[PDB]
């Protein structure tokens, strides 16, 4: 017997354990779950498990790539020791403290908001979750399956879309070595054109979607302006923060008619130019961080592309925009949004 609960969870790792305020324990290796004969409500956003995950990823973010100067929007200028030694993005799992348990909605119908799940399973700890931080797309995620599915905010049109494992989507980024210390390429591999078609078909079928059913009027949409982490895709490779201009990729994946575009942006390519920045806007707190000049050598990173962060925007039945999002936190609501913490009592 139980009741919904809000209490700090304990984290568990396989290798390294300390970062900022966070300290994890060793992973026990048990990923088993037990089926229950009960109906429960689940919600990926109104969720202490994902709320805590967002905070710990933030703690990880500032200790894995060490900033030299922290500039808060308040006006404080804080200097710190910095070098080019960076921690790779880790995986960790959460574990319920004694007297508590973790429920999970084990249902393909789960879309991030489910007032009645009757395929509940219980366990003491969660799956391992990916902690990398990015905008537009999610990389190296743990939730990809042989299907496309959407976590759709129950009270908003915020979404995060899980891309189909079948299409083998990847991204290879490379900043070649020298003897261009601040500019690179990112190559998009896999069957991207079919994966996006399936995203749009999935949206059309969804009960929450009341927009056009003409998939030629459903379009991935770059934000018109704002911070660079919003107008460019934001990612990191070898401890360097990358900002990628995505016009050519959007032209290519949707096979757009580009005649109405400036000549430099008319190209349709599955690779995009990226540049390295030393000043970034922080994603969880208002501020700016300053980092050291980029390292030397050949920088290469190969990732799976597992999710697409977006708002589904329409005001009538004639056009729908899948507007690419810089809401980094949605990544972790996909990673653990099917869990609920309850007090065994």
């Amino acid at each position, epitope marked *: 017997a139980w009741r919904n609960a809000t209490i700090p969870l304990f984290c568990a790792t396989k290798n390294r354990d300390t970062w900022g305020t966070t300290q994890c324990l060793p992973d026990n290796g048990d990923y088993s779950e037990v089926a229950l004969n*009960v*109906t429960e409500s689940f919600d990926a956003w109104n969720n202490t498990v994902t709320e805590q995950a967002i905070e710990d990823v933030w703690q990880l973010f500032e200790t894995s790539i060490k900033p030299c100067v922290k500039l808060s929007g308040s006006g404080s200028v804080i200097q710190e020791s910095c070098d080019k030694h960076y921690w790779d993005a880790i995986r960790f799992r959460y574990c319920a403290p004694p007297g508590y348990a973790l429920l999970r909605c084990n*249902d*393909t*119908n*789960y*879309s991030g*908001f*489910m*007032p*009645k*799940c*009757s*395929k509940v399973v219980v366990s003491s700890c969660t799956r391992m979750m990916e902690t990398q931080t990015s905008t537009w797309f999610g990389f190296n995620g743990t939730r990809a399956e042989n299907r496309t599915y*959407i976590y*759709w905010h129950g009270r908003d049109n915020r979404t995060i879309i899980s891309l189909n494992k079948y299409y083998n989507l990847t991204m290879k980024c490379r900043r070649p070595g020298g003897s261009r210390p601040k500019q690179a390429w990112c190559w998009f591999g896999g069957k991207w054109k079919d994966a996006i078609k399936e995203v749009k078909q999935t949206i059309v*079928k*969804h*009960p*929450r979607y*009341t927009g056009t*059913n003409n998939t030629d009027k459903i379009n991935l949409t770059a934000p018109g302006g704002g911070d660079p982490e919003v107008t460019f895709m934001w990612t990191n490779c070898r401890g360097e923060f990358l900002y990628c201009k995505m016009n050519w990729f959007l032209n290519w994946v949707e096979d757009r008619n580009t005649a109405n575009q400036k000549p430099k942006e008319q190209h349709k390519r599955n690779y995009v130019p990226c540049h390295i920045r030393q000043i970034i806007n922080t994603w969880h707190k208002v501020g700016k961080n300053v980092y050291l000049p980029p390292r030397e050598g050949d920088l290469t990173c190969n990732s799976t592309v597992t999710s697409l962060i977006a708002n589904i925007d329409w005001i009538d*039945g004639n056009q729908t925009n899948i507007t690419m999002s810089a809401e980094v936190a949605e990544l972790y609501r996909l990673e653990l949004g099917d869990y609920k913490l309850v007090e065994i009592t």
Partner: antibody
Amino acid sequence: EVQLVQSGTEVKRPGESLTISCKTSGYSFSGTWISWVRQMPGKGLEWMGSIYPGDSDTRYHPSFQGHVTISADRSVSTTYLQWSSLKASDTATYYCARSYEDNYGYYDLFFFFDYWGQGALVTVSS
Amino acid sequence: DIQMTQSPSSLSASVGDRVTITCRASQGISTYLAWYQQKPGKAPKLLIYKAYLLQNGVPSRFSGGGSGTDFTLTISSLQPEDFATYYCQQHNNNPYTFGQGTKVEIKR
């Protein structure tokens, strides 16, 4: 395959009690709404009510509230429709109807019926 | 309590004709409308849901459209098996209600 198999024809008199049933198979009985639908002779379809077997949540059309009781038994994957005191006007065909299952959780937006029972003829007369 | 008004109550057509039925809601139901087919002595069969989505197995000659209050069902080329009665149903407002039916019979 999903199957909704209803009990057979019924002939009763005004004032008697009646329970008709519908046994399901081929899907998780507890995780989907299942409804009862009346079709009077030569007329259209009227939704009477529904139950979510997984937690016994029920809904009734305002015209049938208080005149019928809908229930379910998960151990035998069966839903029941019961009258306490039949009237002649209750003569009709009654359908078991399952709500669309793959609704992404939004049963209040997709409350339509993809699988139906064969129907049960119920005659009430002196 | 939303009322569904189907037009016309009856309609005659021949194999191969293009037929369209109408359904109107007493108030707006967005895109959440379903269409069923019923033949004498048999249970209803679902054809379309959410106004334009075809249930698995339904032949492609069936199509649905509309949003708000005015909806239509269209059969592009009538076949022998398509002569039956058709009901609409709003499926997002408790209590759920059906149209009173539109019968499609053969012409001669």
